[PDB]
Amino acid sequence: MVDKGVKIKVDYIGKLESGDVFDTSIEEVAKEAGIYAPDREYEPLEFVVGEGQLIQGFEEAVLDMEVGDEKTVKIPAEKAYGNRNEMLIQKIPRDAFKEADFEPEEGMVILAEGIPATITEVTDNEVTLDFNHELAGKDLVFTIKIIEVVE
């Protein structure tokens, strides 16, 4: 039971359109996904439906969830990162890869550490690697789980 202005310590297990746990507050699941991390400590994330903390979508899947509830739904890239961003559209010189089999293609997705570059342009002169994001223009699961309520 929360609203736009109520905090709640819930542990969601955001996954991928493939069911791959990418983010989880429950350290347990972390081990079930092989992401428990080294020393990292997966604790309950206290979000506030009235702070825009988490993506609305999820913020809504909890809006109607008491303390202890669980809603493993997939938020649409529209509610999550709201489709892809335009300010994430990069454009490197063909050379930026010409000297590397990296040969970008009009649909590539290479990251430099985590942020992929959706190469929407494959001009033999350059490529438009739309950085975007991992959940950019993509929907991801959310195995939320209310554990408490705060603010």
- The CATH number linked to 41 is 3.10.50.40
Number of H helices, E strands in the chain: 3, 10
Residue type at 43 in one-letter notation: E
Specify whether the CB–CB gap between 72 and 13 falls below 8 A: yes
102 backbone φψ class: left, alpha, beta (φ>0; ψ -120 to 50): alpha
Cβ-based neighbours of 90, under 8 Å, separated by 6 or more: 117, 128, 129, 130, 131
Solved with: NMR
Which residues span the domain enclosing 39?
Answer: 1-151
The contacts found for 41-44 with CB under 8 angstroms, 24 or more apart, are 42/11, 43/11, 44/9, 44/10, 44/11, 44/147, 44/148
Distance CA 45, CA 37 (A): 17
Distance CA 123, CA 141 (A): 35
Count of domains for the chain = 1
